[PDB]
Amino acid sequence: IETVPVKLKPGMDGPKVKQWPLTEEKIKALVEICTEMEKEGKISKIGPENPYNTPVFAIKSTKWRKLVDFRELNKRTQDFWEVQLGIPHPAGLKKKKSVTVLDVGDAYFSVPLDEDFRKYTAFTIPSINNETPGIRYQYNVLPQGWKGSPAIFQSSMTKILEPFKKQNPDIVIYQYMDDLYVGSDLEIGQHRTKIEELRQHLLRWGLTTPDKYELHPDKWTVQPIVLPEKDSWTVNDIQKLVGKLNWASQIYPGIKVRQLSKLLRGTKALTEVIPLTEEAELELAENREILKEPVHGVYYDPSKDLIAEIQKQGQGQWTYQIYQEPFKNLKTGKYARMRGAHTNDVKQLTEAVQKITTESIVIWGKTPKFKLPIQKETWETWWTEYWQATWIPEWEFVNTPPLVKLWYQ
């Protein structure tokens, strides 16, 4: 129980983010949670001479967990705690036939946090209507959601995990903050029995885990674009097809389209049918054959953090692309799930963001900055209502994505 010293990157002050207004119910859950944590020693009240603040939220399955937004403290510490105490990211985790996630954040709560550092973990429980300045805490142990907590604990973690790895060399185990990804090529029943084996092994060494949720990164990554396959095509369908191929041509080098363009030689009515030429099928079938291949020369770049764009499609579907440079996608996909009595645009969007962030963690070990299609203040109000991860991606709110909505589905 000798604290690891923690130093900030040079010339860098502590975080000073504003704390969001919260409803009375969520303030009461935060007050109960913190009243308990204070008498367990995990946190303590602080005075006016501590200026830093970090946002706090309450989320839910039928009881309230607290959720701290350490994004700003993470930018000002962990970026010098990746160069110093960084966690290597395996490239095999993206390939395993199954991957289960295990929450192991409880392990941080025994370990003391460095005495000189605690000031920077300060947070505020708001009062309603500014009746009081908020209740004002700082952490005395490693906080969940801080990216220094896993880095400090990783020696203890690799020690506790080592005998299980020696027993099962072919399992992959990677740690991103509070979560442990474990991947195997086992049959799903063998995979889940091995997961329960790891849960029992973690319990014998004093690590509780909540459960009493699997990924399949054999994902068919970055799906090819599909042209419509109608039995008979009107001027309108050919115009939409030619425009879609023309947008593709700035991504795929070899698209040809001239014998589809001459196919609308006259100033035709939009609904007039046109037969396809023996020459025009040379455009359609060959553009399909060239559209069914991966783009050449697209590689992940460690020096540049990933970007993820989303487009609502209607009917509960959402298209997304993870990319680092424009028109050079590293992954694309489609989220889709709905229940009419239990689904709306923000629930679908938050679930999609969590799913994309999980894919991004399994694939590259870091998270994308989202370009979310939603009013800013709407999202800032309601995103916590369906949030479930302990981590939070960066995000911003983007103006209209026009007409590409058809071009990505």
Place this chain on the structure above:
Amino acid sequence: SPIETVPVKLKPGMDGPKVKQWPLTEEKIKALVEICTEMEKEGKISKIGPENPYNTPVFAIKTKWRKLVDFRELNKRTQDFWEVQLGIPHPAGLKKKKSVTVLDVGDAYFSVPLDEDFRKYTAFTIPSINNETPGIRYQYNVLPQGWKGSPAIFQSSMTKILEPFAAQNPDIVIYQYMDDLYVGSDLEIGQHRTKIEELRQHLLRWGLTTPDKKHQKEPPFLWMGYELHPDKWTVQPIVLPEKDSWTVNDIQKLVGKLNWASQIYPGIKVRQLSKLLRGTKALTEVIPLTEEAELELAENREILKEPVHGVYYDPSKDLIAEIQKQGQGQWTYQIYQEPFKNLKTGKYARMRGAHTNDVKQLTEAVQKITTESIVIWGKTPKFKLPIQKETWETWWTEYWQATWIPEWEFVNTPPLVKLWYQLEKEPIVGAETFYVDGAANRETKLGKAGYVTNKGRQKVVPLTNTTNQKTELQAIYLALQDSGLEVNIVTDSQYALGIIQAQPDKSESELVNQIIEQLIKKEKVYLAWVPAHKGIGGNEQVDKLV
């Protein structure tokens, strides 16, 4: 005096203020030594023998001179603190109490001791006898006025002095605010007066004077621009000046007063009055008021002639909020719990989106009100809105953004929020197909707009003082004018397709308004797009024409 001090650092690397004293006039020096011997006898300051390198200047000003101590160079150097309570309670969020009193804490900052190790950094000096003799050297033992740390250290010191009293009196409500305590209770009068004297004695035991019941402020309370009444609240009376001429300064002050009043007086409008400020920010630039602006101002005076009041919150009752449209993208709303009284009122405006839509603006207003409800009461209102279920459902299903729509019910008070037209999702069989294009010269600023149809019609129209995007909107306006009630249109412009596929009800550009009229009139309009300069057919001929 016995209060525990808050430890205080200097900023890292930085060291304490060493500042040469300015010369002081003869009448002021003795007037300062006079205040200083009394401050010392009270223990607020203490003399020092100059082993202390630091100094800051001391001014005087005035039947009783006061002393001033510039502290910028020290405040530059001391550590940051917890930010001192930005914002204030909203009276709509207070709950009624049978008794309310207001205690001014006197000498507030000088009653709370300064941290010991830091006191040496507050040294100051009084010149003596035209700098012919060394002056006195005092230093503070308590929070200086104007010190960067005084307000937040006093706040937390006060909150700690109140702890035993709140512990012993769970039912009494105390609000802190700077020098003031606001105490409310549901005790019968006399029991409340006894508790006020108890709290006053407890405060004096910690060295904090408070007004005697002969000097405690009487209701209604004039606080932060409100009149706080025992059973109602309102804003302090608004005065709108009548001027023969108006500067940007005057329009700023007027827009501010009108916005302030809008929290309780319903229906105040600010659009035209604030459009005057859209130009250059030179504060003295006199601007003529416009016709619509003075109409708006008179319509505001009409509402301000009659006084209006708000009620306080009752947690047992439901929280209802209702929204009404006004002209040019203005919306007003009332938050209320009872049929004839409001908790508060307010407005919303589209705030410089180039083209907007009634359902989008109504949704943004519901968003603004949801954020206000969470801030002021910690919950969100039930909504009563002038829109039908099918209208909003259709809009939020077509719309490209995600959107949260809370529980709400229809209120059939016109004007109603409606969808004024809908583009067809698929091309119109049997309807004429216009291919349109428009082009312009960026230097000469003249252009052409035209169309070519499958029926064989063609037309071209000259344009002066236009831009290459404005011409492509003009070409669509042309096709709408020259077609029957069902028309297909094929444009080569991404910009025009974005402006029109958003389905706006309104725009600050007159040409888009003229298009919106034609879209409401036409029975069906399919709008399609193709890349320019690709020889598509139709678009090729139209591009050749222009």
